Design a protein around this motif. Structure first.
Motif, mmCIF file in Angstrom:
data_model
loop_
_atom_site.group_PDB
_atom_site.id
_atom_site.type_symbol
_atom_site.label_atom_id
_atom_site.label_comp_id
_atom_site.label_asym_id
_atom_site.label_seq_id
_atom_site.Cartn_x
_atom_site.Cartn_y
_atom_site.Cartn_z
ATOM 1 N N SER A 134 57.525 70.882 20.491
ATOM 2 C CA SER A 134 58.293 70.763 21.189
ATOM 3 C C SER A 134 59.468 71.745 21.407
ATOM 4 O O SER A 134 60.013 72.171 20.634
ATOM 5 C CB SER A 134 59.039 69.196 21.253
ATOM 6 O OG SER A 134 59.934 68.965 22.306
ATOM 7 N N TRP A 135 59.687 72.190 22.681
ATOM 8 C CA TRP A 135 60.806 73.013 22.635
ATOM 9 C C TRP A 135 62.305 72.328 22.556
ATOM 10 O O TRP A 135 62.509 71.160 22.868
ATOM 11 C CB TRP A 135 61.091 73.694 23.724
ATOM 12 C CG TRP A 135 60.335 74.491 24.561
ATOM 13 C CD1 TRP A 135 58.957 74.480 25.752
ATOM 14 C CD2 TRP A 135 60.322 76.026 24.359
ATOM 15 N NE1 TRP A 135 58.860 75.776 25.676
ATOM 16 C CE2 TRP A 135 59.226 76.577 25.047
ATOM 17 C CE3 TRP A 135 60.990 76.681 23.475
ATOM 18 C CZ2 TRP A 135 59.216 78.134 24.751
ATOM 19 C CZ3 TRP A 135 60.848 78.024 23.079
ATOM 20 C CH2 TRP A 135 59.562 78.821 23.867
ATOM 21 N N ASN A 136 63.235 72.975 21.853
ATOM 22 C CA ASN A 136 64.503 72.262 21.757
ATOM 23 C C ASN A 136 64.891 72.109 22.914
ATOM 24 O O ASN A 136 64.612 73.111 23.975
ATOM 25 C CB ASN A 136 65.231 72.909 20.586
ATOM 26 C CG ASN A 136 64.666 72.729 19.344
ATOM 27 O OD1 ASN A 136 63.906 71.801 19.060
ATOM 28 N ND2 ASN A 136 65.333 73.434 18.428
ATOM 29 N N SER A 137 65.912 71.332 23.259
ATOM 30 C CA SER A 137 66.479 71.093 24.348
ATOM 31 C C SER A 137 68.029 71.725 24.385
ATOM 32 O O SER A 137 67.967 73.096 24.650
ATOM 33 C CB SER A 137 66.825 69.681 24.509
ATOM 34 O OG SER A 137 67.672 68.987 23.684
ATOM 35 N N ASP A 138 69.020 71.059 23.785
ATOM 36 C CA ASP A 138 70.378 71.911 23.599
ATOM 37 C C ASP A 138 69.803 73.122 22.715
ATOM 38 O O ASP A 138 69.296 72.967 21.677
ATOM 39 C CB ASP A 138 71.271 70.921 22.608
ATOM 40 C CG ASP A 138 71.719 69.845 23.840
ATOM 41 O OD1 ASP A 138 71.487 69.970 24.641
ATOM 42 O OD2 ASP A 138 72.290 68.883 23.204
#
Lengths: 132, 48
Positions: free
Chosen positions: B35-39
């Motif tokens: 998953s891509w990090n968000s922050d």
């Protein structure tokens, strides 16, 4: 180890009618087969399609399914649509509510469930005289 | 160059102890963290 596996298989060894001889599984297929072999392993990817036609048993039963088919609309539960395989001694089951992204609409003429890829363990495939 | 890139990633996968593996990424954290990090990490170093 050269494993010679056809890229597609369309033939039948056995056939059955439904419980009430109202409908039957229609000559379905195995439109594609892919595989990978390794020392001590074999993975075969089968992407079959399940087909249903509401044809009853020849006789007054075929005529009765026609009266059904022509005077109303279909039903069939995708969760119970399945393909069961046995590679030699290893049994696996795949279902249409997991391995089919688009379900066919209800119909009495035909339905078609196309499975994406069924990964089957061929390490249990027992060869006699190098054939299994 | 191809062979060496395969130590990190193989689109065709890998064979381990004769078994066919179900992964392409051969570096544990690249296999994980799908998953891509968000922050974002707030930094000036692209390496961090």
């Amino acid at each position: 180890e050269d494993y010679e596996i056809p890229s597609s298989v369309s033939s039948r060894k056995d056939y059955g009618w439904g419980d009430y001889y109202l409908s039957m599984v229609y000559n379905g297929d195995i439109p594609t087969i892919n595989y990978k072999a390794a020392s001590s392993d074999l993975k075969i990817y089968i992407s079959p399609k399940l087909r249903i036609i509401h044809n009853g048993y020849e006789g007054q039963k075929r005529n009765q399914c026609n009266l059904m088919n022509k005077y109303g609309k279909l039903a069939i539960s995708p969760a119970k649509v399945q393909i069961i395989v046995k590679a030699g001694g290893k049994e696996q089951t795949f279902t249409a509510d997991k391995d089919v992204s688009i379900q066919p609409s209800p119909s009495f003429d035909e339905m078609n469930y196309q499975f994406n890829a069924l990964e089957i363990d061929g390490s249990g495939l027992n060869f006699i005289n190098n054939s299994a | 160059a191809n062979r060496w890139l395969k130590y990190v990633w193989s689109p065709s996968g890998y064979i381990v102890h004769g078994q066919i593996q179900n992964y392409q990424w051969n570096v544990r954290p690249l296999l994980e963290d799908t998953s891509w990090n968000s922050d974002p990490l707030d930094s000036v170093d692209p390496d961090a």
